[PDB]
Amino acid sequence: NVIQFYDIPGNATPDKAWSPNTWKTRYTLNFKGIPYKTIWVEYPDIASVCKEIGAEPTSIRPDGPYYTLPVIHDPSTGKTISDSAAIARYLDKTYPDTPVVIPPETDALHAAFNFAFSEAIVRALAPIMLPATNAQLNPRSEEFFRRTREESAGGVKLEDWAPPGSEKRAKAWEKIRAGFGQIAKWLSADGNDKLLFLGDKVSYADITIVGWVIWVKRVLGPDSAEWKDFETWDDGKWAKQLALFEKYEVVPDA
Amino acid sequence: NVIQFYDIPGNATPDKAWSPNTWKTRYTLNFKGIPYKTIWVEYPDIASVCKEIGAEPTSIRPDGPYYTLPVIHDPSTGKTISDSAAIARYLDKTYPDTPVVIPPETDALHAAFNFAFSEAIVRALAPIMLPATNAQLNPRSEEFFRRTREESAGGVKLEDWAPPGSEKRAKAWEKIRAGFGQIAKWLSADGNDKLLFLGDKVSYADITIVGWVIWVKRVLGPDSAEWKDFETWDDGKWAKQLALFEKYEVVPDA
Numbered sequence A, B: 001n002v003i004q005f006y007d008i009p010g011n012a013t014p015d016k017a018w019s020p021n022t023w024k025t026r027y028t029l030n031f032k033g034i035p036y037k038t039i040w041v042e043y044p045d046i047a048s049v050c051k052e053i054g055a056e057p058t059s060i061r062p063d064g065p066y067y068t069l070p071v072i073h074d075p076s077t078g079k080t081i082s083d084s085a086a087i088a089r090y091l092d093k094t095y096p097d098t099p100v101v102i103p104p105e106t107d108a109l110h111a112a113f114n115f116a117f118s119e120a121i122v123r124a125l126a127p128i129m130l131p132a133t134n135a136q137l138n139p140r141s142e143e144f145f146r147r148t149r150e151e152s153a154g155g156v157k158l159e160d161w162a163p164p165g166s167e168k169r170a171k172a173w174e175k176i177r178a179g180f181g182q183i184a185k186w187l188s189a190d191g192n193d194k195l196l197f198l199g200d201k202v203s204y205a206d207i208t209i210v211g212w213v214i215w216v217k218r219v220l221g222p223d224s225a226e227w228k229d230f231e232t233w234d235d236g237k238w239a240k241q242l243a244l245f246e247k248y249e250v251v252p253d254a
Ligand SMILES: N[C@@H](CCC(=O)N[C@@H](CS)C(=O)NCC(=O)O)C(=O)O
Pocket: A019, A020, A021, A022, A043, A046, A058, A067, A068, A069, A070, A082, A083, A084, A085
C-alpha cells in the first residue's frame, strides 16, 4: 500500500533507472524520504498503463493525448498524478511534514524556471542524448523511440544527428556548454556563487538539474570522455551538485 | 545630489518615457520610493555617455562592448550601475529600508525568470514593437534605430517586418499571445491564480512584466485596437497588473 512509481527500464545501469524526467521524481521521493514501489513500463506500453491506472496525459497535441512517465499512484489517497512538476506539488501538499521542495512563494518562479530550463538545457541536450538513450533501450522501446524521435526530427536518422568526431556533435556540445553556463550565471547573479537555487535549502529547481544531469552521466557513461569533460565545466559546479544529492541517487530493489 | 537615472526620450507620450528596459528601472525607483532625476539620452549618444560616466557595458559580443540604458549613478555612493536587473539588486542592498524587490532566496530564480521571460516574450514582441517604437523616436535616434535594426534583420525595412493587415502581423500576434499564455500558466501553476509572482508581495519579476507591457500600451497607444484587444487576454490579467502598478507609472516632474 505504498506509493507506486512508474519508470522506464534501460540497460545503461544495472538498476535500470536512466530517464531524466523520472529521475526528477525519483530524487523527489528519495529527498522527501517517502516510500515507493517501482513499476517498470516499456515506452510503447506507457499510454495503455496510464489509461489503466487513470493517469492524465501531460500534454494534448495535434494527433491527440500524449502520455508520459513519471506517474505516481498514491493508494493512501486514491490519486493518480502525472508529470514530475505536478508530482512534486502533490507530494509537498499531501505529505507536508516531509521537506518542502517548492515553497509557495517560489511556486510561480519555479514554473518560470522550468520553461527557462527547457529552452536552455533540454533542447540543447537532445541531439546527443536521445540517440544515446535509444542505444540502451530494450528492443520494444527502441522501436517506439527511434520511430517517434526520428519522425519528430523530420526523418533524420539518429545516426546523423551528431556522429562522433563530427562538427555537428562538436557544436551540439558548445550549445550544451553555453546552456549550463547560463545556469551558472543565475546561481551567482548576486555575487554569491550558490550550488542551490534558494541558497541553503534544496528546492525542486535543484532536483530538476540533477535529474537531467544524472541522465547524461548514466547514459553517456561515468567513465566516458564526454562525461569526464562535463565534470570540469564551471569549476565542477555540476559534478558538485551531483555529489550533494548522491545520498538520494538510489533505486531500491525493495 | 539625487540618483541620476539615464533614459531614452520618445514621442509616444507627453512625459517622453517609453522604453521597456528603462521602465523596469523607472517602476523600480518609484515603487521603492527613491528620489531620482531623469536625464534624457538619444540612442546614438548612449555609448558615449556610458563611457563618460563609467557605466559598464551590459553585454560583450565579438564585435565589441554593448552599452545600453537604463543606467543609474548614485552620488551618495559614487557608483554607476547598468542593466535594470543589476540596478534592482544594487538598490535592494544599498537602500535596505525600501521595499525589497528581489528577496535573496528568490535571487537565482529571478535570474532564470529573466531568461524565461526574454525567450517567451521579448523575441515575439520585436517584429511588431521595434518598428512602432522607431516611429516615435526623435530624428537623431530614428536614424540610429532604423539603421541598426534593419541591419540586424538582414536588410528588411522596418515597414515590411509585420505590416498592418498582413499575415506576418497576424502570426506575430499569435506568437505574442501564446508567450503571455505561458506567464499566465506560471502564475497559476499551483491552481492559485496570482497576479504577483510571490503571491501577495511585489517582486522584480512583476516589475519586469509591466515595464514591457506599458511599453506596448504607450507605443501602440492606449486607444489602438491592438492594445484594447490586449486588455482582454487571459481574462484581463495584464490589464489588471498595469492597474496594480498605476501608482508608480509616473515620470516625476522634477
Ligand atoms: N513534462 C514531463 C515530461 C515527461 C516525458 O517527456 N517523459 C518521457 C520519458 S523521459 C516519456 O514518458 N515519453 C513518452 C513518449 O515519448 O512516448 C515531466 O516532467 O514529467
